């Protein structure tokens, strides 16, 4: 006759242990949300004041700040790992650059400041459009793939905590709420997961950053609005995975201004921060689209690529999502870490003279060719 009651805190008491059981009850409810939509609805139905995160930012060590909130380790370089007349692409790309810059006739922008930014967008879009067509015969997957043009990626997660120092809720512990909304210049979405760049649970000596000051101390402002986690398309869209993301940096964050501002070293940080923010935010949404959340962390790593260009230089980034658990409860027991591999920005061509572009660098084009040709195994 062993009927002893469990030694647990009373749910109805006004104590930390009692509140913890009440807190655990809600966490248990999220475990019991069967459908993806129900999981998302429960997490995002309440609006609370939360930090607004800009994927592209000029903050010092911005890549480090984002990694600390995300638990992403950024290893320098590319992740460990059909001929199409690579020379032909250069000629085709050379025509595309000359097409927009020297051949197309369009109404001049009124502002006179968006002219430089507008031109960079046009050439990048054309190269992408022609590249998809030229690569289509070699890789039928691209034919079934979904290419997204300037559609938004959303993600919402909690990292860190703080105690209210004043007000009607003085002393209450409040988690730091964050949100990244990003609109990559272009991104490729596929219905099949990409080949993983490294086995799950991979551990490396490089360590996640930790931030000395609060997110508020650095410019980052908490606002109450809808919580959104989005892959660039609805759950109804068949393409719940994707291959590569394309980013175009604005003029303010471009290399020339940053060097003038003396933040030359942060040019890569701006590249790193945008890539880590976009890929993690985008990759995490797919796993949520697969039903995985913090307490139901992914059983298979989520991997993808991203490319960020400043108009002239081009950088290539690879991200693998191993952990969906950044909440203290779910992160309490997790040895996994998110791993990001990024390459430094490199020029794609030298100059445009007459009707012939000079100094085109195939090496950057080769990475694009490698990315376009890669397909799930």
């Amino acid at each position: 006759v062993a009927r002893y009651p469990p030694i647990v805190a009373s749910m109805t008491a006004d104590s930390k242990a009692a509140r913890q059981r009440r807190v655990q009850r809600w966490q248990a409810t999220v475990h019991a949300a069967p459908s993806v939509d129900e999981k998302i609805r429960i997490l995002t139905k309440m609006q609370f004041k939360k930090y607004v995160v800009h994927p592209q930012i000029s903050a010092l060590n911005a890549d480090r700040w984002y990694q600390s909130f995300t638990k992403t380790v950024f290893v320098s370089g590319l992740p460990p790992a059909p001929s199409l007349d690579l020379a032909a692409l250069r000629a085709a790309v050379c025509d595309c650059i000359l097409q927009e810059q020297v051949y197309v006739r369009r109404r001049r922008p009124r502002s006179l400041f968006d002219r430089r930014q507008a031109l960079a967008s046009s050439i990048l879009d054309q190269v992408v459009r022609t590249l998809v067509n030229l690569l289509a015969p070699l890789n039928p997957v691209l034919s079934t793939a979904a290419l997204d043009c300037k559609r938004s990626v959303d993600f919402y997660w909690l990292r860190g905590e703080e105690r209210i120092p004043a007000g009607h809720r003085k002393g209450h512990i409040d988690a730091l709420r964050y949100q990244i909304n990003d609109k990559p210049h272009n991104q490729i979405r596929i219905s099949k997961q990409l080949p993983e760049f490294v086995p799950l649970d991979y551990s490396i000596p490089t360590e996640i950053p930790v931030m000395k000051c609060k997110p508020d101390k650095l410019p980052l402002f908490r606002r109450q609005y809808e919580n959104s986690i989005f892959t660039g398309s609805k759950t109804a869209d068949p393409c719940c995975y994707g291959h590569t993301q394309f980013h175009l940096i604005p003029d303010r964050l471009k290399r020339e201004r940053l060097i003038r501002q003396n933040q030359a070293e942060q040019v890569e940080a701006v590249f790193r921060a945008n890539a880590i923010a976009s890929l993690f935010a985008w990759t995490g949404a797919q796993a949520m689209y697969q039903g995985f959340w913090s307490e139901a962390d992914v059983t298979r790593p989520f991997v993808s690529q991203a490319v960020i260009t400043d108009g002239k230089y081009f950088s290539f980034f690879c991200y693998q999502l191993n952990t969906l658990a950044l909440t203290v409860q779910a992160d309490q027991n997790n040895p996994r870490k998110n791993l990001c591999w990024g390459s430094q920005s490199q020029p794609l061509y030298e100059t445009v003279e007459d009707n012939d572009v000079k100094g085109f660098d195939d090496g950057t084009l080769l990475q694009i060719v490698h990315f376009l040709l890669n397909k799930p195994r």
Binding site: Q261, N262, Q263, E265
Partner: peptide
């Protein structure tokens, strides 16, 4: 600060008890 410079604020401003009521002056 730029150039990788860092700043830290300097540490500025681093009668006898047996005979009471008779002043000790008195020898009387």
């Amino acid at each position: 600060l730029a150039h990788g410079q860092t700043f830290t604020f300097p540490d500025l401003f681093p009668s006898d008890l047996r005979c009471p009521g008779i002043p000790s002056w008195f020898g009387l």
